[PDB]
Amino acid sequence: SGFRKMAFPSGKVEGCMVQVTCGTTTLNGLWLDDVVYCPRHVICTSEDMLNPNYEDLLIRKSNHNFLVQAGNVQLRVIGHSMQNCVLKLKVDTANPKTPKYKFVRIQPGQTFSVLACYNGSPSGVYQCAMRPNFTIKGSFLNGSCGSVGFNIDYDCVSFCYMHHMELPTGVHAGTDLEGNFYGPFVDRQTAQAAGTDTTITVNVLAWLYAAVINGDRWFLNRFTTTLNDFNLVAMKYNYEPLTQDHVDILGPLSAQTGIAVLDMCASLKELLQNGMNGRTILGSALLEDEFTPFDVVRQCSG
Amino acid sequence: SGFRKMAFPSGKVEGCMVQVTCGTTTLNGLWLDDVVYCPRHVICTSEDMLNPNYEDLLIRKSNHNFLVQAGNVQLRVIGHSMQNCVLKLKVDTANPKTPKYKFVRIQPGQTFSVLACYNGSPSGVYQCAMRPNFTIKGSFLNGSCGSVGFNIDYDCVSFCYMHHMELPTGVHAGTDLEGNFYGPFVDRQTAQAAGTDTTITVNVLAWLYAAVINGDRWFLNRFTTTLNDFNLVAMKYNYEPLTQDHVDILGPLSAQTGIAVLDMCASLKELLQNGMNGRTILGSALLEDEFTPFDVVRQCSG
Ligand SMILES: COc1ccccc1NC1CN(C(=O)c2cc(=O)[nH]c3ccccc23)C1
Ligand SMILES: COc1ccccc1NC1CN(C(=O)c2cc(=O)[nH]c3ccccc23)C1
Ligand SMILES: COc1ccccc1NC1CN(C(=O)c2cc(=O)[nH]c3ccccc23)C1
Ligand SMILES: COc1ccccc1NC1CN(C(=O)c2cc(=O)[nH]c3ccccc23)C1
């Protein structure tokens, strides 16, 4: 037992991290096969970020202006191109450590592991969710751009995120590996609103099921509710509406604990309206929404 | 910015994980050079755990009874010995992926990353602390024994923990890599008390400094206190007494934020006595104590 915010083992991704420098700007790149993927803002100066014309800025760059280093060895850049907000630097050597991989555009409410890197060197790994407002609550400092988010399915790494920027609320924005930002964000220095940070209801319910599997059962009540009644309370607390598809997704956890999904909704409705009363659930004093039903099942069964 | 429970990149440790089977028992081993380290309870049946005589049980085992598998390849066991609560299985092949390493016995209040493994395959990585009561709050299921805890200092892995068991409170107990348990725990099926789970005060203060660096400043007040006055309140809440050595350790964070250590103690005293009033600090509704002052500096500077 026990329940922690667990990340995937990062080894497969560590073997893909390189340093990319253009002028005075250094950030991280992801080396897969003979291509290095990195944020296109590597070509920008601080002044350029106020109103960058990436097409015009990129024309002043040649292959030899992109310095790519893998550990202590320099890679030779034989091509470059921009795809949405990422650059693809073709190198003359295929990464010998390229794992089996896919590029996926993750859905809001889903989770992934981030390997935070600086100067092409991995520094830490943590788990996060793609919030409904398409931001992540990461931990990224100066030089972290190009760090990636991923999931692992046995031996295949599904890359889903590349880090590009930090927004005014302290939250982070980035793209999928095709260079398309998650959400309405743009790689420019303009204050950008993420919008209401709604709570991932199905994930809160999954985490309440994890708590029950772990013996934390104080919050269970003798009540039930309906989807429509629960959602009237969910709306008030900026929780995502719970759908029948979410109920179906919670099926296995509901059956494992013997607690019907709508009975768990009634418990969550009471927790929202009355609070925790100074009590905790799985070592937390707030309702946690960054664990999917898959994450809970994986962590509670193997 | 941002502050997450961040673990070290696990790649170096993933290359050391093997599966060890003895009879019907399978768990994980740590393969470093030509030795595989694993919990000695791998030799036990469920019945043996009620009152095991490890010396007598181990005499009925020969090298060929320990099946060690590294991925899909079987390693040849050419020796075995017991050191405290670990077995050391000498194999005929040195692990080609053996990183630079040390075995360290971590101090209570310090943190480390755990690579949770099952059947010799890494499943997840998370960060935790060696609690003052020498337990960890991990996430470990059946088959997780032999998973290790470690820290990384550039290219050197300091192994500090090997997983052995789960206690009645849902917390975990284990040994250093010399096989000595942290705390009073024994590898037998008897209900074992961990004692009062005291809060790591210096770590709470480090985390309050992290919150201030991250713009969360609501809890700062116009007060100061003394070590002796603060400790009178700390005792009441089962917090560890704050010493001058802890104040010295918080020196760099105090100076970075311009908030004197005793001024931060006054804020923590008010948080303990009055609560959070429904507010959060770094996305938490309770005072977090599993980040050391080193962890905060590393995550806030690089
Ligand atoms: C003016 O620069 C931009 C403007 C608009 C968009 C992007 C940039 N630059 C990019 C963002 N960069 C960082 O390194 C970074 C990322 C981060 O998540 N948090 C930070 C905190 C402090 C200092 C830097 C960062 C490079
Ligand atoms: C805080 O975000 C903005 C605020 C006002 C206007 C624009 C933004 N967004 C963009 C995204 N940026 C960063 O990633 C970034 C770049 C940097 O050089 N230093 C930072 C320090 C702190 C937080 C972010 C950054 C600037
Ligand atoms: C009766 O066995 C013991 C008695 C005293 C001491 C040890 C054992 N066995 C060991 C402990 N094992 C596990 O696999 C394990 C570890 C864990 O942390 N949590 C669990 C939860 C559920 C089922 C198993 C575990 C093997
Ligand atoms: C809960 O711990 C005890 C309770 C009463 C008496 C003894 C213990 N301690 C020991 C340490 N054990 C385990 O690691 C363990 C072994 C197992 O086979 N199944 C478990 C299921 C749940 C939690 C722990 C275990 C038994």
Side-chain angles (χ1 to χ4, degrees), chain A residues 164-168 188-192:
Chain A
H164 286 247
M165 69 195 271
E166 177 167 324
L167 305 174
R188 298 168 229 196
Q189 193 174 322
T190 171
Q192 299 167 54

Side-chain angles (χ1 to χ4, degrees), chain B residues 198-265:
Chain B
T198 60
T199 303
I200 310 151
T201 313
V202 66
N203 286 11
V204 176
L205 289 166
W207 172 82
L208 285 179
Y209 276 120
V212 165
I213 294 163
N214 278 268
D216 274 18
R217 307 190 57 104
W218 67 263
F219 55 88
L220 299 180
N221 60 35
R222 301 172 165 276
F223 318 148
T224 196
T225 186
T226 65
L227 275 188
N228 291 162
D229 176 70
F230 171 77
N231 284 334
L232 291 185
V233 183
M235 174 149 55
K236 182 200 157 88
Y237 291 88
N238 286 135
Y239 265 59
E240 279 201 301
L242 198 75
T243 69
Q244 187 56 51
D245 284 346
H246 292 143
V247 173
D248 292 341
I249 289 163
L250 298 157
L253 283 169
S254 169
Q256 182 188 330
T257 61
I259 299 164
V261 176
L262 292 173
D263 293 4
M264 189 60 83
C265 288

